[PDB]
């Protein structure tokens, strides 16, 4: 019985107790015009599916291969004394192989969303 596991058992019972004192002590009393989602005092139709930009999905698809490197650098940082002068160069090469894929990403401007607010580039040629 350490005092580590009283805590992880003990936070929930506090949360369940506060949720229970709300469910017990406040009234319930609903109806139909109370129910329904909030948008600014006006109901509307929700569209069944909507379109999105490729950068929105690309942030979190692209997030994971950078996250997997940051957890791959975590075995090295604990053994940094043992692999003196040698695991250093291997981790350099590993990080450099990553950095060139990153500069691919920043050269393509993959996460940037353009604006279609073009200021009418084309001048006025007449006749």
Partner 1 sequence: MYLTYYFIEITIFLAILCTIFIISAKNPMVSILYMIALFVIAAMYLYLIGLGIFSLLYIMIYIGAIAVLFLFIITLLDINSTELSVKSNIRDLPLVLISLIVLTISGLMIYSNDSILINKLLEAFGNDYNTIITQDWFNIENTTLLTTIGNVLLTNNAFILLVLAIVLLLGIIGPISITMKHK
Partner 2 sequence: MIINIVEILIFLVCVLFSVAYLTVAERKTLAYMQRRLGPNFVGYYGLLQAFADAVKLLLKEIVLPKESNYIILVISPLITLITALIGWVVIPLGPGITLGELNLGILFSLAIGSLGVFGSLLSGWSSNSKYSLLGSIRSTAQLISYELILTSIFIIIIMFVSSLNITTIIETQRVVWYCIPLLPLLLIFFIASVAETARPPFDLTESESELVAGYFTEYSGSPFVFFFLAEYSNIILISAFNGYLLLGGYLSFNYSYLFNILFNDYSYVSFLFEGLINSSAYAIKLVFLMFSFIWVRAAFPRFTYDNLINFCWIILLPLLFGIFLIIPSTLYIFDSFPTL
Partner 3 sequence: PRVSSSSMPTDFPLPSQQKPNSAVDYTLTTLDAVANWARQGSFWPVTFGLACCAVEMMHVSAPRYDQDRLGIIFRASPRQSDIMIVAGTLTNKMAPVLRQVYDQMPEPRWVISMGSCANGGGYYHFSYSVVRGCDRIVPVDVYVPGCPPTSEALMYGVFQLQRKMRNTKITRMWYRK
Ligand X SMILES: CCCCCCCCCCCCCCCCCC(=O)OC[C@H](COP(=O)(O)OCCN)OC(=O)CCCCCCCCCCCCCCCCC
Ligand Y SMILES: CCCCC/C=C/C/C=C/C/C=C\C/C=C\CCCC(=O)O[C@H](COC(=O)CCCCCCCCCCCCCCCCC)COP(=O)(O)O[C@@H]1[C@H](O)[C@H](O)[C@@H](O)[C@H](O)[C@H]1O
User: Which chain residues interact with ligand CDL by CB under 6 A?
Assistant: 20, 23-24, 28
With respect to ligand X, which residue has the nearer C-beta, 5 or 125? 5
Work out what residue 123 binds among partner 2, ligand X, ligand Y, none; the CB cut-off runs from 5 to 8 Å by kind.
Answer: none
With respect to ligand X, which residue has the nearer C-beta, 9 or 68? 9
Which one of residues 25, 35, 42, 96 is an interface residue with ligand Y (CB under 6 A)? Answer: 25
* Cβ-count burial 56-67 (b if 16+ within 10 Å, e if not): eeeeeeeeeeee
Listing DSSP states for 69-95 in one string gives HHTTSHHHHHSTTTS-SSHHHHHHHHH
> What are the backbone angles phi and psi of residue 51, rounded to the nearest 5°?
-85, 160
Work out what residue 93 binds among partner 2, partner 3, partner 1, none; the CB cut-off runs from 5 to 8 Å by kind.
Answer: partner 1
Query: Rounded CA gap, 111 and 58, in Å?
Result: 7
Q: Do the Cβ atoms of 98 and 41 come closer than 8 Å?
A: no
With respect to ligand CDL, which residue has the nearer C-beta, 30 or 41? 30
Choose the stretch contacting partner 3; rule: CB under 8 A; options: 20-28, 57-65, 68-76, 79-87. 20-28
Query: Rounded CA gap, 11 and 3, in Å?
Result: 13
Site string for partner 1, 56-95 (x = CB under 8 A): xxx-xxxxxxxxxx-xx-xxxxxxx-xx--xx--xx-xx-
Which one of residues 7, 31, 45, 52 is an interface residue with partner 1 (CB under 8 A)? Answer: 52
């Amino acid at each position: 019985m350490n005092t580590f596991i009283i805590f992880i058992i003990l936070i929930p019972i506090v949360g369940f107790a506060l949720l229970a004192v709300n469910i017990l002590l406040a009234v319930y009393k609903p109806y139909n015009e109370k129910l329904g989602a909030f948008e600014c005092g006006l109901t509307s139709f929700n569209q069944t599916r909507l379109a999105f930009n490729a950068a929105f999905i690309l942030v979190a698809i692209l997030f994971l291969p950078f996250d997997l490197e940051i957890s791959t650098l975590l075995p090295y940082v604990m053994s940094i004394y043992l692999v003196s002068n040698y695991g250093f160069t291997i981790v350099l090469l590993f990080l450099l192989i990553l950095i060139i894929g990153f500069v691919y990403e920043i050269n393509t401007n993959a996460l940037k969303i353009n604006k279609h607010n073009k200021p009418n580039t084309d001048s006025l040629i007449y006749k």
